[PDB]
């Protein structure tokens, strides 16, 4: 409470995007990183040619590092960031089926029956919303032949390219993969709910001009709301 | 005892970095499609702690990498080396191959921390050699590198094994690296208790066949 007044009393640091040499530290998952970072850096080349960016995984501690200001912004599903945090809804993950373009049998739209006949690569994606996919399919009684399981998304494009495996992936991932790896997608035959992704900042930095500048750029580039 | 690949139902568990996963798993799964149609594979990162223990106990069958801590109780066999190259988009406005040290220190970089791996040594090495870099972006892992280089004028120092997987998909080209970054030897590792396990031996020989650069 006395903090809120002290944070308001301080003369806020000037932010000139053309001249700033500030480093912004951003927490996001490997999916957020492959999705946001290319167009973010593309925009920043034209908007703020001298700042530095670095990213990290949320899984820190994030809460404490955001209060100190060691981490500027966090993107994801971060249930623990509650008191002292502002948040804003950016976009949703929708899950699709992905497989190579000239797959011998896979169809779009894929049926639930075909989904169950084909072989899968699964992604564990521990402590993320993508991590709930396995449990969701299992609980629904949807059988999958789990031919390969990997912990993270990096190898999925090249794996699907070279095999007749299919994958359950967020559409934002699939979109970065379809052309580079000669892949197609189908809408997903199971009942997978969306994951709503938010951008988070600490209240200490709610009126920090640099922070405000960067988060508005995230809204501008990525907001679907 | 003995082992039948064409009818085995065994799950093998394999420890591997993200570079390892992205380079070995496509041709590995491709081979297995024919040779072992019924086995299961799962992978994990070495730094998802207690690898020694999980290898001793047979929870993890094989490890791939530079894993200096795997000594007594473990066998190892050299498969190949990492050579560092410079990578950037094919229609980059100014970047040339072979790239000079001058251009290297003038262009802007994306760096990969790759903590607790051989690749994690790059930053310190270049620094101690007094090679300057404008670190415009630092990311912890390699997943976003291809798309980042495609959409920017950034350049990256990456293992050639990564680069060769990214060049055509992302429209990138590579250059020999102007610095003197040492090559990194990549070994296959297995626990002594599993030296003569027939399933393990069979998978090890398949790694050798697909990946060894000996000849």
In whole angstroms, give the CA distance from residue A206 to residue B51: 43
In whole angstroms, give the CA distance from residue B203 to residue A87: 49
Structure tokens at B27: 């041709």
Could you report how far apart the first and last alpha carbons of chain B are, in Å? 31
Residues of B in contact with A181 (CB under 8 A): 169
A125 and A169 share one domain:
yes
For A109, other C-beta atoms within 10 Å of its C-beta total: 10
Q: Cα dihedral angle (B105, B161, A174, B15), rounded to 10 degrees?
A: -120
A1 and A61 share one domain:
yes
Q: A153 to chain B: nearest residue by CA?
A: B143
Asked whether the beta carbons of residue A153 and residue B143 sit closer than 8 angstroms, the reply is yes
Asked whether the beta carbons of residue A37 and residue B139 sit closer than 8 angstroms, the reply is yes
B138 and B189 share one domain:
no
List the alpha helices (DSSP H) in chain A. 2-9, 30-47, 62-68, 112-117, 133-139, 156-162, 171-177, 209-222
- The count of structural domains within chain B is 2
Number of residue pairs across A and B with CB atoms under 8 Å?
A: 113
B172 and B193 share one domain:
no
| DSSP secondary structure of B147-168 | HHHHHSS-BEEEEHHHHHHHHH
B100 min Cα distance to partner chain A (Å): 23
A5 min Cα distance to partner chain B (Å): 35
Whether the Cβ atoms of residue A15 and residue A210 lie closer than 8 Å to each other: yes
Residue A78, phi then psi, degrees to nearest 5: -130, 80
The angle subtended at Cα B130 by Cα B125 and Cα B132, nearest 5°, is 95
Whether the Cβ atoms of residue A26 and residue A76 lie closer than 8 Å to each other: no
> Which pairs with CB-CB distance under 8 Å and at least 24 residues apart come from A190-193?
A190/A112, A190/A115, A190/A136, A190/A137, A190/A140, A190/A142, A191/A140, A192/A95, A192/A133, A192/A136, A192/A137, A192/A168, A193/A136
Residue among A110, A29, A84 at smallest CA distance from A204: A84
A interface mutation test: which of B13, B27, B139 has the most A CBs within 10 A? B139
B177 and B187 share one domain:
no
B152 and B203 share one domain:
no
Output DSSP code: residue B141: S
In whole angstroms, give the CA distance from residue B32 to residue B25: 10
Output DSSP code: residue A163: S
Residues of B in contact with A176 (CB under 8 A): 147
A76 and A36 share one domain:
yes
- Domain with B78 in it: 1-83+183-215
Of A34, A57, A181, the CB nearest to B144: A34
In whole angstroms, give the CA distance from residue B71 to residue B63: 13
* Helix A30-47, helix A209-222: angle, nearest 10: 110
The H or E element containing residue A89 is: strand A85-93
Q: Return all residues near A212 (Cβ < 8 A) that are at least 6 apart.
A: A15, A206
B34 and B104 share one domain:
no
Asked whether the beta carbons of residue A38 and residue B144 sit closer than 8 angstroms, the reply is yes
**What are the CA-CA distances from residue B91 to residues A76, A182, B151, B173 (Å)?**
33, 21, 11, 9
B40 and B123 share one domain:
no
Pairing of strands B40-44, B172-176: unpaired
Look at the alpha carbons of B132, B133, B139, B144 in this order and tell me if their dihedral is positive or negative.
negative
A183 and A216 share one domain:
no
Asked whether the beta carbons of residue A158 and residue B44 sit closer than 8 angstroms, the reply is no
A114 and A137 share one domain:
yes
Structure tokens at A63: 């809460």
Of B135, B140, B170, the CB nearest to A56: B140
**What are the CA-CA distances from residue B46 to residues A106, B43, B181 (Å)?**
34, 10, 23
Could you tell me which residues of chain A have a Cβ less than 8 Å from any Cβ in chain B? 30, 33-34, 37-39, 41-42, 45, 52-57, 121, 146-155, 157-159, 161-165, 176, 180-181
A182 and A216 share one domain:
no
What's A78's domain CATH number? 3.40.190.10
Of B29, B144, B147, the CB nearest to A148: B29
Whether the Cβ atoms of residue A76 and residue A197 lie closer than 8 Å to each other: yes
Beta strands (DSSP E) in chain B are: 11-15, 40-44, 62-65, 74-82, 84-89, 108-112, 134-139, 156-159, 172-176, 184-191
């Amino acid at each position: 409470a006395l903090n809120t007044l002290q944070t308001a009393l301080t003369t806020r640091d000037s932010f000139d995007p053309f001249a700033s040499t500030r480093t912004f530290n951003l927490a996001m998952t490997d999916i957020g990183e492959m999705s946001v970072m290319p167009p973010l850096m593309e925009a920043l080349a034209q908007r703020a040619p001298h700042i530095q960016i670095s990213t990290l995984r949320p899984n820190g501690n994030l809460k404490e590092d955001m209060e100190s200001g060691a981490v500027d912004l966090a993107l994801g599903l971060l249930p623990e960031l509650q008191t002292g945090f502002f948040q804003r809804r950016l976009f949703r993950h929708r899950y699709v089926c992905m497989f190579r373009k000239d797959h011998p049998s896979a169809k779009s739209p894929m049926s639930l029956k075909q989904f169950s006949e084909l072989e899968h690569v699964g992604v564990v994606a521990l402590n993320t919303g993508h991590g709930e996919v396995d449990g969701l399919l299992e609980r629904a009684g949807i059988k999958r032949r789990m031919r390969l399981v990997v912990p993270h998304f990096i190898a999925i494009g090249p794996i699907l390219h070279s095999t007749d495996l299919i994958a359950t992936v967020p559409q934002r991932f699939a979109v970065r993969c379809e052309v580079p790896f000669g892949l197609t997608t189908s809408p997903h035959p199971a009942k997978l709910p969306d994951i709503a992704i938010n951008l988070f900042w600490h209240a200490k930095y709610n009126r920090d001009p640099g922070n405000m500048w960067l988060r508005q750029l995230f809204v501008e580039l990525f907001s679907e709301a």
